Structures are given as C-alpha cells and as structure tokens.
Amino acid sequence: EVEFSHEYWMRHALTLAKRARDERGVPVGAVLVLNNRVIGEGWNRANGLHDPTAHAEIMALRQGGLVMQNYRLYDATLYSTFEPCVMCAGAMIHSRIGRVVFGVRNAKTGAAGSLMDVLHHPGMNHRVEITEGILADECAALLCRFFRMPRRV
Amino acid sequence: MSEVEFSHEYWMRHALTLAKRARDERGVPVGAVLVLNNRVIGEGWNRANGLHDPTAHAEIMALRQGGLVMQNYRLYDATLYSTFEPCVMCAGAMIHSRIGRVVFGVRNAKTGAAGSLMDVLHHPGMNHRVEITEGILADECAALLCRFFRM
Ligand SMILES: [Zn+2]
Ligand SMILES: [Zn+2]
C-alpha cells in the first residue's frame, strides 16, 4: 500500500498473524511502529510460549521496550489485526504508546468499545488514541482463519 | 496473631518479602507469589525499568514463571498472592491464566482493576471467573504504599 500509512503497517500485522495459526482463537498479528520504523513485532503464541500474556500486542510491546531500552514507548503506534482485550489494553496504557490501530472489533472480549472501554476509561492516567477499520475486510476474514493470496504480476 | 503454615497470611508474608526487591522502581513496591497445592511455582516483583518490559509487574512474573514450570499458559486451580491490587494489565492476565483465586492485601486507588478503578475479574462477559480475596495482611501491605517495612 501507500508507504508509511495505516494500511501499510496493517499489511505487516496481517502477515505476522499467519504465525498464530496453531493457536486457540482468532489469529492476531501486531507490529509496533515509532517514527515510521519497526521497533516491535508480535503474534499470538500463548501455547507456544507457555505464557498466559503472550498475545500479539504484548509481544510487540515487549520487543519494543527491549529495542528502545525503556519500558515507556512514547509516541509509538501499535497496529493490531484485532481489538485488544482487557490485558492488552492495559499494557498500552502502561507503555504510554500514542495510538492503537486495530482492524475489526472483538464483540466478545474486546476492551476498546465492544465489551468495555479500558483505553478510554475516565480513571486512566494515559489516553491512547483509537483508529479502527484499517483493512477491515481482510482483518474480519482473520476471524474465520482466512488469509489472502492475490494475483501476482 | 497466629500465622499458620501454608495459609493465606503465610503466603502474603512471602510476597511482602519479595517486595523489597522492587524498592528502586517508580511506584509502590509490589510482590507476588503463585502457589499451586501449597507449593511455589511463580515469584515476582516490579521490574519494569530494570528489564525494559512494560509488562514486568509482580503478578505477571508469577504468571510467567508459573507458566514455565507448569509447561502450560493455563494455570488452573492456582492461587496468586500479591501485596497490591492488580492493574488493568495484570487483572487481564489472571483471566487468561484461569487461576482459581487472587489474594491481594490493599487496594490500588490509582490503577487497580479489582474494585478501585474497575472490576474486570468479575465482569459477566469473561470466559473465566477468578475468586477475589482482599485484606490479607492489609496493615503490613498498606505500609508498603509508603515504602514501610516491618522489623
Ligand atoms: Zn490481548
Ligand atoms: Zn499490574
């Protein structure tokens, strides 16, 4: 897509979601971007990592803190193929990231407007901007484990 | 009073000792220990700045260490003792851990997600319900908010 755009980074998250094919649930892929540069990548690997927190968004935030040598990732934007859960939404507030961009909503456990809104809770110390709908048609297909293979040349 | 072995107050004192290792972190020192069948399977304290990990909270390390020993990201029937009420990020990890009970001492009137800022653990839309027990060693845990330790 157009370079350094929301749809551009969403395609990177869609590719990473394929690594979560052998996980119980919707495959989620996440990428953490700061100043048009990748500082963190992640996919769902709870069973593969024996970590109850090994979500796509969390692995991207965990890798970003190692790259930035700081648990605070100011002005960073996190691209996820799925609406964050209550655990992932809480991690973005503590990371103080600038924005989360997810494609399709999680009408079962999503914490960005569906089941609740943890990112926009009035009692929070940080506000993370929310942008939804980026590559929504392809991200919605991830709910049924569908991936795209378009025509080449 | 009397603190029986393998009891809630017994494990809370173990978490209070672990909290000393998080004294050099921005915020109140929190200590957590994960217990399954009266055996320690996970320990943790605040190490966000020391490890460059925004998720390096006390309860999360116990769940992360617990998942490593249990060889399973699902820690059924496990009890998590923390010196502080969990935040929104830690409380979300306990739902995914499928632990049986969380035991925290004092409430977190700033970032707590177990009654203070919200109650996510008992939300009806969750796939798992974690039992809540609060107030265990509250006096020794409330002093931890002001960096006070008993001698
Ligand atoms: Zn999540
Ligand atoms: Zn926490």
Residue numbers in the entry:
A (entry chain A): 3 to 155
B (entry chain B): 1 to 151
Mind quoting what the paper says about this structure?
Here we describe the development of two families of base editors, CABE-Ts and CBE-Ts, which use variants of TadA to catalyze the deamination of cytosines with either retention (CABE-Ts) or loss (CBE-Ts) of adenine deamination. Through X-ray crystallography, we show how the accumulation of substitutions impacts the shape of the active site cavity and may contribute to the accommodation of cytosine as substrate and the subsequent shift in specificity toward C-to-U deamination.
In addition to the perturbations on the right side of the TADAC-1.14 active site cavity, evaluation of the TADAC-1.19 structure reveals that other substitutions (E27G and I49N) from our evolution caused major structural changes on the left side of the active site cavity. These structural changes are likely caused by the E27G substitution, which results in the loss of essential hydrogen bonds between E27 and A48, I49 and G50. Because of these hydrogen bond losses, a conformational change occurred that reoriented residue E25 of TADAC-1.19 to a similar position that was formerly occupied by residue E27 in TadA*8.20. The displacement of E25 shortens the α1-helix, changes the length and conformation of the loop between α1 and β1 (D24 to P29) containing the E27G substitution and unfolds α5- and α6-helices, reshaping the TADAC-T1.19 active site cavity and potentially impacting target nucleobase binding within the active site.
